């Protein structure tokens, strides 16, 4: 089972196919394409949003916790951008370079196609022309015969008439004759020609053709792939951030805190004790 | 160290400090609020894009694979989404809701401490008062007193003269004597009121403030660490998605593929053999 086979007969579906093939590896394209511009969106959300809680009292554990909430949350985004600017973009310039020279595999693909038929169908119109004459000149040499079949019957008529007569219809027998060995000639020529059309090049070029398919199919499958693997790359860094996290939350020490609380305004005075009785008598 | 101890003289300081400390709780709040709204954006997103693709054929695995991108990216995307309006969005609001009591538990502990000042300023206006009523009485007695020993002194003058002086001078001091005693009980009561306001009402009342403190920070710490476990929950997700994708894309079959095609415009038909020679003669 192959196309230039058992699709012999299918140029102008397979045409067909293999562009609604590129039309979907275009769409494909594009799909990634917005989903990347999605990501490189929600990176700069949430860079701008640590940006934005960042200060304009740090020493608080419960400040420095925040501090690093807001700066692992930075490095997170940061780390997810470049992933995407360099990995998931390059996917997709690969992709459009790609599809460029599948359009031109294509365009030349059918060319080679188009040609082997204008080639096969400029021979018919030979061996075509070259019958019309045998035919013509075979009624002419008819013609001829019968006249002088007349001539030669007609007790009327002279030696000289019959003649004339007589040559009439032998030079068109040999017309005839000279056409049917250049029919015969041309007919073999095509009968070579279409069968090197049918079991060659039409075999040859539809073979190039699903080749060129069965590519085009793999790597689209491939590039989801590789896609996949540079999108299971946060899950590492996820991890890593998350885990900055519960360690800064961790470190949170409210006993500590209320220390610096007490070095912070203890004033080093002390109550004032009972107060003395003046006793002006 | 206690701040009932170590800054019993710090009521507005620790006012500053504790509205300082409620502040940043609900600046931080305002993160986690704004961080939450940015993912349930992201899914919508990512949700919205698996709808933009879905077809308006299907027998290709090319587009089978297709499919399963665009499913299981609306799989995770609502996945997604719902841990966030389920978990994420409950932190905040029992968030929300602590710092609602935090606030009123602010309001009564400082009420309390504004309530012991103003009675221990009331004794004080008291025993000021007493002690002042002591003094001129006194001032009474004295001028009084000074006044009988001028008239015992004078040669000229009448027993009679002196004698409404020596009563004027003696009812004097009696007074002087009773304000002492007013103002000598009134001087225990203070000292007993000021003594209770330095170690016991201050104390008390500080130590509930500083609690209240220490727990806020402690659920801050908190409800980063728990927003961090339901933010680490979408890797089990991510990782199931990537590898439902990549499933899909090894599904590929580019070969089964073209048999379909085949299927697909097989004619039946079968090429012209050689072309019959047709001799007119």
């Known amino acids: 089972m192959s196309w230039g086979t ?4 299918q140029f102008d579906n397979l045409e067909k196919h293999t562009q609604w093939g590129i039309d979907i590896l275009e769409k494909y394209i594009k799909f990634v394409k917005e989903r990347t511009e999605i990501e490189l969106s929600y990176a700069k959300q949430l860079r701008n949003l640590s940006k934005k809680y960042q200060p304009k009292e ?6 420095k916790a925040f501090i690093s909430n807001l700066n692992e949350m930075n490095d997170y985004a940061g780390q997810h951008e470049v992933i995407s600017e360099n990995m998931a973009s390059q996917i997709i310039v690969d992709l459009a370079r790609y599809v460029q020279e599948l ?6 693909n059918f060319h080679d196609g188009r ?23 075979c009624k002419e040499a008819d013609r001829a015969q019968q006249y002088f079949e007349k001539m030669d019957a007609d007790i009327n008529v002279t030696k000289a008439d019959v003649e004339k007569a007589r040559q009439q219809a032998q030079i068109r ?49 491939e590039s989801m792939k590789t896609y996949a693997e540079v999108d299971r790359q946060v899950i590492p860094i996820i991890g890593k951030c998350l885990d900055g996290i519960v360690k800064a939350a961790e470190s949170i020490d409210q006993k500590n805190d209320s220390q610096l609380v007490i070095e912070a305004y203890k004033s080093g005075f002390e109550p004032p004790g009972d107060i003395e009785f003046e006793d002006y008598t």
């Open 6 to 9: 058992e699709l012999w007969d």
């Open 58 to 63: 740090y020493k608080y554990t419960s400040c």
């Open 103 to 108: 359009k031109q595999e294509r365009k030349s």
């Open 115 to 137: 040609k082997a038929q204008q080639h096969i169908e400029t021979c018919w119109k030979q061996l075509e022309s070259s019958k019309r004459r045998f035919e013509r000149d």
């Open 173 to 221: 027998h040999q017309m005839a004759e000279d056409s049917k060995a250049d029919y015969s000639s041309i007919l073999q020529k095509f009968n070579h020609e279409q069968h090197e059309y049918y079991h060659t090049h039409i075999p040859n070029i539809f073979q190039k053709i699903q080749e060129m398919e069965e590519r085009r199919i793999v790597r689209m499958g």
